[model samples]
Target: NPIKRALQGELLQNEPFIQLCTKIENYLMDTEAVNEQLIELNEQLTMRLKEKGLKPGEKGATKQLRTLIQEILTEAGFREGMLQTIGNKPLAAADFMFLVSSGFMLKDSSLRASSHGELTHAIQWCLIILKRKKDSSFLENIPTSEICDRIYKKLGHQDSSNPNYPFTCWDVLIDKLGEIDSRSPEWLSDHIQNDEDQIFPVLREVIKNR
Candidate 1:
């Protein structure tokens, strides 16, 4: 049901798919209906994967169905995770952190950086959304700034006060990928999708500038 609702256009406002809906709408299309068709296609592919009792990324797999199912799962999961995170549902924070940190990295490092920035803003807005949902009376009626101060303190970010720690959230995340220099494209692409280099050229650019 959650997945159905997510596919039915109730995703968090910031997910990219919602904007794609606008583009479709501008072209005089039924964006929601198109999204539904995509979801139906997504579900069918996933069911086929399970029916075969094989992992979506198994080696020498049914390349056609496997690739299609994997892509569908990735895109669907990405949007759903962000939507749940912004909604602050139970398990949202950990789910989001894990995906942005590891799952996106599994896709490509550039995707990791791209999602890192996206997720940090989502976290910031999580706090704001809570305040409005609680009518500004929660957190013991503390001022929003003080609430943020305490939040960062609890989260162990000294940069909440230190001007010297001058990286945006993406910079903080991207820096954590320093060990990537040791990873050869051959090795990385061997395990992940080889064509990810083409889909995400920014991976090379980020590594280049680094």
Candidate 2:
């Protein structure tokens, strides 16, 4: 099972786990809040599981979710440093999750030079806060998948990650991606083939929300 495998791997890759522990301890010194960092810590765990063909979502959700991560980065003109890597040392999945989480919520804004913190705050209005229906108010009213699609539509994103593809945006962000998406699946397959310069405009307004 992935869980078992993850445990074994965690034992071997001791540095990140130790780093997590130190951060957790420092935060415990301050507030009693469970804190978003814990969520980030676990996200790294899931990212590793993904490499092993295991996942937190259903069969397709993981791929779609991560692909969405790649998509927004394409739009954002991410130069690849934090969650991006070559080998031996892996990228921080928590940071990557934040990258995807911010992209999934914030539409058409490229975060650069420490601007992502502001982007995360502004985009919270759109993020689905829960993973499932639980009858609790804390549970999200909308499915996260729906939320993901909503961001996709708002940014006028095509399935194509093609940098050369013209920028597209909706008249207003739509609710149903399937109903509204005009880009064919072929665009997605050809995404990496393009080297179009990133065109997202700065959302200085996002700082106000932060």
Candidate 3:
């Protein structure tokens, strides 16, 4: 099974979290043997960091998973939707524009900006794994939109060739993130996966492509 194959220390190079995720996924397939290691890891980390309570949430060890994701998006200038919670909690009634907004913000946001940048990137990779579901070539032969398409698709709130878009596959990507700014993720602005289809895997491919 894909899960078993993913477990035997077999994720691609430099992908420790992915290997761990694969192990967890394998366990998901066979719940009796494998367990929710991420849930365990999340707990352990939270406990260790319990003293360092989330300042944004006001004196509490946040158990809400969405709060974590919101922190990242917020850094990239992603604000909660109108009629949504004020802080880091993800709005339950998010829209397709939300995915597009995220893409706009993270096009090349450094993996270093977030304390868990690497882990965050790994989680994005995990989303790819989940999005693919059972397909392995999720990274291979992805839909490479032209610069214009990428612009209009993700950040197209205005002009397509506005030249304000972030640099895309055109640039050679380094493993670690570089200096970050509002302008960086412009490259990601136009990727719009509006419907029920999830967007994380597509974002993961953006990394792979770079």
Candidate 4:
């Protein structure tokens, strides 16, 4: 694409930007590729419908295929913020996806039935990331359920107005939390609880079981 322009290059500087660009490209390719797969399935369904001489209207492949394709594409899609945050730091995809999924799981009442364990892991991951980073600021970047925010504040996080804060002895805080009585009411409630006391038992059990 660059003929004589190649001879006019200057200092090369693309650390995080290059990474972000790559992520964008990768996501585009991945999602479109997934869309292609969905289309393929849709085509198969369409062909099956035609084979049976079924009309494409009411109760037809055309409608079902449209819905199927949409759902499949959505399931494989990525949020722009999530992709950008990954480029900003070293946040793992599964971690980001867990947080993203948590928002949806909480929103759809139909999804709530199976989301207890997912919510637990979402809280656990937030704490795990906090323990590693020792900063609450990183928590602001991803989608946060009310449960996540409640837990974050419970763990002594600052107000939502502040986007960034320095770390001071997350290790000490966690060490104190690591010993919460595993039978408190906070521990008894099976929902919307992100207290360190509640989390301690869960984290302890995870470690023990693993």
lDDT of each: 0.31, 0.29, 0.29, 0.29
lDDT tens per residue, model 4, 15-86: 322232232223223433323322344355555556766544435543443343334323323121212241
TM accuracy, model 3: 0.23
Count of backbone clashes, every candidate in sequence: 0, 1, 8, 0
Candidate 2: stretches off by over 4 Å: 1-37, 40-44, 50-128, 131-136, 139-210
For candidate 1, give the lDDT.
0.31
List pairs with backbone clashes in candidate 2: 163-196
Instruction: Output the number of the TM-score-best candidate.
Output: 3
Candidate 1 per-residue lDDT, tens place, 103-168, comes to 231223223334222222332223232332344443334444343232222122222112344432
Instruction: Write candidate 3's Cα lDDT for 40-88 as tens digits.
Output: 3344334434455532233332332344434433333344321223343
Per-residue accuracy of model 2 over 41-129 as CA lDDT, tens digit each: 23443554466665344444334334434443343333222242333243353443355544433322232223223223222221122
Model 3 lDDT, residue 153, Cα? 27
Query: Any runs in candidate 4 off by more than 4 Å, and if so which?
Result: 1-39, 57-59, 70-100, 103-210
- C-alpha positional error of residue 107 in candidate 4 after TM-score superposition, expressed in Å: 13
- After best superposition, candidate 3 residue 197: deviation in angstroms? 31
Per-candidate RMSD, Å:
19.8, 21.4, 17.8, 21.0
